Ligand binder design. Structure first.
Ligand SMILES: Nc1ncnc2c1ncn2[C@@H]1O[C@H](CSCC[C@H](N)C(=O)O)[C@@H](O)[C@H]1O
Length: 327
DNA sequence: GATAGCGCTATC
DNA sequence: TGATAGCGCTATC
């Protein structure tokens, strides 16, 4: 993450829905805002959230009386992405886990926060011939909110990871917010190799397999792209190896494969998966962040987390727009 | 709950 | 196209 000195969000209060690891919290908190509520049903997710913030999130959002939610100014939610990701059976709203947005909508209707800040996968945009995005657009407008959305890739914001997500910022119609903008991209100066751990700490993640085929050769030049080097087995998800000289492929939560959830990387002549801490780093988490004790749950957690640095920039801008009230 | 081999879609 | 990436799905212990 980065340091912000013009804490544009100082007096505001926010809600951390689908908290997970708290990526949103870290993000807004660094801009001066204060988290007044958190929600997360996963036992293991609750444990890390507590380890790091001292709070234990409330349970299943579905059975929560919206009125019970504290007055808040910003609503943060990176709702479930399985039903929309290019990686699954795209059942969308028909999927048992595709309706959460509507819960967001009921919370919005009742609480009327100044800002709604959501995050989802890139395919959310194209899904069902854009009909899903549309339902989300109209619903929002209908509740009296402007709807701004853009697909941003983390590699354009200082993090060596290809993670194209769609960000939806909605402003209550009152405040004539006509000056909001998404952060301007910038050259990538940090690559995977820069975030790795000393070999001593990683020895146990090394995986030597015989069906390890090598398609391309290691590169000499650093590049802001996922340069694949090899494949293992049939080369499906989790069995593809990348160069630590490019950028990390997207980390996943339920991903399988021998290089389960992080993909594999050629580190100093050896083939291995990323260590939880490295995932944290690749998501822009500070090294002070305490990872969950079960590596399986740590990988899952980071798999569906959010790239902090990006949210920071966006949060800052959200701040700037709200603070421009000239005479 | 932890592990891993899958088989499909979007994108150009 | 033909080759790549994808906050995944699901069967086994
Ligand atoms: N009905 C529900 N109630 C509460 N939390 C829920 C839920 N359905 C899914 N979740 C939680 O939704 C989360 C989505 S992942 C989003 C993670 C968050 N942005 C962070 O930065 O890490 C998961 O933790 C999942 O357990």
């Amino acid at each position: 993450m980065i340091e912000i000195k013009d804490k544009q969000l100082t007096g505001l209060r926010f809600i951390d829905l689908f908290a997970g690891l708290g990526g949103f919290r870290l993000a807004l908190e660094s801009c001066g805002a204060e988290c007044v509520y958190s929600n997360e049903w996963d036992k293991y997710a609750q444990e890390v959230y507590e380890m790091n913030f001292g709070e234990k999130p409330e349970g299943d959002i579905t059975q929560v009386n919206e009125k019970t939610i504290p007055d808040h100014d910003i609503l943060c939610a990176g709702f479930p992405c399985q039903a929309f990701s290019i990686s699954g059976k795209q059942k969308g709203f028909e999927d048992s886990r595709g309706t959460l947005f509507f819960d967001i909508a009921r919370i919005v209707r009742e609480k009327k926060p100044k800002v709604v800040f959501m995050e989802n996968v890139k395919n959310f945009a194209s899904h069902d011939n854009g009909n899903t995005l549309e339902v989300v657009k109209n619903t929002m407008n209908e509740l009296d909110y402007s709807f701004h959305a853009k697909v941003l890739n983390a590699l354009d914001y200082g993090i060596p990871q290809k993670r194209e997500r769609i960000y939806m910022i909605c402003f209550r119609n009152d405040l004539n917010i006509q000056n909001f903008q998404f952060p301007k991209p910038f050259e990538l100066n940090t690559f995977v190799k820069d975030l790795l751990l000393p070999d001593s700490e990683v020895e146990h993640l090394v995986i030597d397999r015989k069906d390890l085929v090598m398609t391309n050769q290691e590169i000499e030049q650093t590049t802001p792209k996922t340069v694949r080097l090899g494949i293992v087995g049939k080369g499906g998800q989790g069995e593809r190896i990348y160069s630590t000289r490019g950028i990390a492929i997207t980390l996943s939560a339920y991903g399988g494969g021998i290089f389960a959830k992080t993909g594999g990387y050629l580190v100093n002549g050896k083939t291995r998966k990323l260590h939880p801490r490295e995932c944290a780093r690749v998501m822009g988490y500070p090294d002070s962040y305490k990872v969950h004790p079960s590596t399986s749950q740590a990988y899952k957690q980071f798999g569906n987390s959010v790239v902090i640095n990006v949210l920071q920039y966006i949060a800052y801008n959200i701040g700037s727009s709200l603070n421009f009230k000239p005479y």
